[model samples]
Target: VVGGTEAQRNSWPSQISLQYRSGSSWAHTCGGTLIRQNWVMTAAHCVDRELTFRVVVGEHNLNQNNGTEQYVGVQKIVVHPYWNTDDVAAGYDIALLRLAQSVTLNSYVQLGVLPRAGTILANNSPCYITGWGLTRTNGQLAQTLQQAYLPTVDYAICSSSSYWGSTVKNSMVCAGGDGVRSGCQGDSGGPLHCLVNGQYAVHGVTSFVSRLGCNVTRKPTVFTRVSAYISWINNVIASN
Candidate 1:
């Protein structure tokens, strides 16, 4: 998160770190939401590179053991069939990962509840983007998880010429155009948790920000709208 604060370890229990084999050690590459005991929802772009991957649940500090962490291997990856690497702006940037084993639920580790299908938040609805992404443009990733209050920018305004324009599709959710707080590199695939009916639900899978910068004016962080893919998620889980 570009403009973020250190997150409480238990604030977002479903939050997880998606890591890749970086030489002798694993490195955080993206964030994901634990959707099931063995399934995770993330962005397709996060797994575009062919590399050894793992999911760490109940993690707080990357370097510290934290004792609450649970490490598991990735058994299978299911990137949306329509996702195009060369054209991320075209949308369909969602993905699901099947863990080798199921993770146990705890105060620091739990499943994220997703929004109902076709559900859309009202303009400027309250939401937060949580991740281990960079603190700023071209900055180092944070060892601790971070979160930013990024209010939703509805499609009607986000699609305007001054904002994301044509790049902001209905399949995507845009938030935080304040040019201050936003999602950055290493945060892709994280959850955009929105408060609804007194409960928090995962509504977005962090997808992209402007190439110009992480926190650019009128260029809020874009996410794959989870509600739009409820059917696909169910099919993938059942068939896999």
Candidate 2:
């Protein structure tokens, strides 16, 4: 994240690193949220390359093994049927990955609770975006996990001409157009944890940011609204 702080290892237990094998090592490509023991929710764009991927749970630092990490292979990928790689701005950017084996639940690893279908946060609701993404536009990825407070910018405000305009949709969540803190490259598919009723829930799957820059004014990070796809997620998990 741009202008984010280092996150504690246990701060977001549901957070995970989605990696691709590179020669003898793995590279962190995106972030994901563990929903079921063997299922992860992320962005369809992250897996568009068709590369061999793995999910790393309890990972705080990408460059170092924290000992709490659990590595597992990806067995299957289910991209939203309507997802169009060339039209990401049109929404439906979500995807689900089934792990080869179920991951054990522990203090360092847990499932993320998703918001109910059709749920929408009030304008400016409290939220945070976490990932191993870049610290700035065109910068290198961070050595450790990072997080930034990115308040929700309701659809109306985010869809305004000066803001994201027609690029923002109801199926998406916009947050942090402040031009100071936001999700950058490598942060896609990460969770947008929003606080509600004294609890935190994964409401979004980080999808995209301004093409002009990572942290551009009036161009907050856009996410695939999880609540908009609750039924779809459940159906896929049940049938697969």
Candidate 3:
């Protein structure tokens, strides 16, 4: 994320490193959340290539071995049927990956709790966006994980003419348009954990940022609203 601080080791247990094989070594490409023992929730755009991908659970650093990582191959990829890469503004950028093996949960590795179906956050709701993305626009990836406080911008405000206009939708959540902190390229598919009811829950899947830049004014980082797809997620896992 741009303008973020280094995150603590166990601050986000469900955050994962989604990497792709790059010649001889794996490279961090995107971020995901462990929704189940063998399932990860991420953005559909992260798996655009047919190349092999792996999920690293309990990972805090992208370039160093912390000894708390659990690597697992992706066995199946289930992209939302309505997802169209050309029309991300239509709000179906979500995907789920089933792991080849179930990962063990510990203090550093655990499942992300989802918000209730149809749940929506109020304006300026407290939230955090975490990932190992760039520290600046067009910059390199971060060596360690980073997190930035990005309060929610309600749909009505985000969809207004002065903001994202028609680009923002109710199926999405907008946050961090303060021109300081926001998600970047490698942060895609990461979690937008919101603090609600005195607990944190996975309310959004990091989807896209403004075309102008990573941290643009009035153009917050957009996310796929997880609560909007609760039934779809459960169905995908149940049938597959």
Residue pairs in clash, model 1:
none
C-alpha-based local distance difference test score of model 2: 0.95
Clash number for each model: 0, 0, 0
Worst 10 residues of 1 by lDDT: 131-140
lDDT of 1 by residue, 1-240 (tens): 998999998999999999999889999999999999999999999999999999999999998889999999999999999999999999999999999999999899999999999999999999999998899899999989999999999999999999988988999999899989999999999999999999999999999999899999999999999999999999999999
Output the lDDT of residue 237, model 3.
Answer: 94
Which stretches in model 3 have alpha-carbon errors above 4 Å? none
By summed lDDT, the worst window of 10 consecutive residues in model 3 runs over 58-67
Clashing pairs in 2: none
Q: Rate the local accuracy (lDDT) of all candidates.
A: 0.95, 0.95, 0.95
CA lDDT of 129 in candidate 2?
A: 99
Quality of model 3 by C-alpha lDDT: 0.95
